[PDB]
């Protein structure tokens, strides 16, 4: 199998800047007929991947001229001369030269912005849930940048990792930030035999976390 290696996997850019994504072939992608079936797809959030460039440098119908593609042998490049907001998403290189036809891992093209600390919100279990013998403690770490943050839960002075499930949103179309939700799932009995519930936003520390808590 031909392995396609994409450099970088995350590309932070400012609107109007140049952007370049590289696709490196683990072996030659020249088909038995002489053509190189190297393509670039763009997948916008909520949408399917759509072709931009095919046969290394041929633009597809309706693709702007800011998108160009180049390469030879084992190194191919996608260039975006001037980044527009509609251009954000995941860029995949694909080879159709040798079976099995393979794709790269994808390159998240992202909007660069100033660092923002998260808005940490902790919520005790809802009384409706306790009625069924479950107790979910919910925490939101909203509107932060970049993704260099983590959650830490503490129950009565001890870190807790079991029963924790995290979920991340894509880059926000409002302000280019990120958000995540963390859920600590306990039985009603587990919840009722502890008092202090802490949620923390941590960053390679060194740093002082943003702490939110409640007493039961």
């Amino acid at each position: 199998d031909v392995l396609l290696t994409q450099i970088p996997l995350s590309l932070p850019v400012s609107l109007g800047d140049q952007a370049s994504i590289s696709c490196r072939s683990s072996q030659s992608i020249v088909h038995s007929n002489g053509n190189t079936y190297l393509e670039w797809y763009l997948q916008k959030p909520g949408q399917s991947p759509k072709l931009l460039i095919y046969k290394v440098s041929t633009r597809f119908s309706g693709v702007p001229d800011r998108f160009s593609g180049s390469g030879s042998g084992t190194d191919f490049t996608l260039k975006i001369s001037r980044v527009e907001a509609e251009d954000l998403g995941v860029y995949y290189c694909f080879q159709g030269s040798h079976v099995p036809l393979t794709f790269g891992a994808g390159t998240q093209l992202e909007l660069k912005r100033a660092d923002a600390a998260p808005t940490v919100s902790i919520f005790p279990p809802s009384s409706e849930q306790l009625t069924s013998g479950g107790a979910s403690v919910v925490c939101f770490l909203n509107n932060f940048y970049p993704k260099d943050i983590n959650v830490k839960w503490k129950i009565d002075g001890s870190e807790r990792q079991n029963g924790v499930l995290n979920s991340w949103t894509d880059q926000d179309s409002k302000d280019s930030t990120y958000s995540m939700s963390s859920t600590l799932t306990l039985t009603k009995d587990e919840y009722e035999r502890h008092n202090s519930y802490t949620c923390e936003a941590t960053h390679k520390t060194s740093t002082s976390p943003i702490v939110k808590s409640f007493n039961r």
Partner: protein, 210 residues
């Protein structure tokens, strides 16, 4: 003008076989070159499964070859995917795609969930706190995907964050938050609207102070 459209059961039990249909309009499936099936794993990687040429000959991914069959109906202008001993690991968005000198066209994709789980309605929990105020909603233990979460029937949108569903264990869970001015809550009504098509569920949950 040119359009490819996937259809088929969006839920299959492990060991059973998935069958998908691609209906092409705009041009004949008899036009060069390849008529492909591709899949995108949950929040993930794309894998090319195989193709049927404009002349009816097939080429498959060597890993899939043994479980896979791609056929067509030139009269109906449709091509088909059959994938045999399905596993929880075959849960993906399946796309039908064409390729020629014009480039390529794709379908919108069809999500196929491979599970032994039974249709479960969600439990919707209002999340109130213990200048700006954040409220939440916990949509726990439903099956299958999807649900639709709104706040105040759609009239809130601005400071809303709906989080992707996490799968544990055979059931999905998701949360949503809304951040409104303190002058607005509890003075005005903030409601969480959750709908689960698969179980004809439509819950409205008022966020009330504790």
């Amino acid at each position: 003008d040119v359009q490819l459209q996937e259809s088929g059961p969006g839920l299959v039990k492990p060991s059973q076989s998935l069958s998908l249909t691609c209906t092409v309009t705009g041009f004949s499936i008899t036009s060069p070159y390849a008529w492909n099936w591709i899949r995108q794993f949950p929040g993930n990687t794309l894998e090319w499964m195989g193709y049927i040429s404009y002349r009816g000959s097939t080429t498959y991914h060597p890993s899939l070859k043994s479980r896979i069959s791609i056929t067509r109906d030139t009269s109906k202008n449709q091509f088909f995917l059959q994938l045999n001993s399905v596993t929880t690991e075959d849960t993906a968005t399946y796309f039908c795609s064409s390729y020629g000198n014009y480039g390529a066209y794709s379908g919108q994709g069809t999500l196929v969930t491979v599970s032994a789980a039974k249709t479960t309605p969600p439990s919707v929990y209002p999340l109130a706190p213990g200048s700006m105020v954040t409220l939440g909603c916990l949509v726990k233990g439903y099956f299958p995907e999807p649900v639709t979460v709104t706040w105040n029937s759609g009239s809130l949108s601005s400071g809303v964050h709906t989080f992707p569903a996490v799968l544990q264990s055979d059931l999905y869970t998701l949360s949503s938050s809304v951040t409104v001015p303190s002058s607005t809550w509890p003075s005005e009504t903030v409601t969480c609207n959750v709908a689960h098509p698969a179980s004809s569920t439509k819950v409205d949950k008022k966020i009330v102070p504790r």
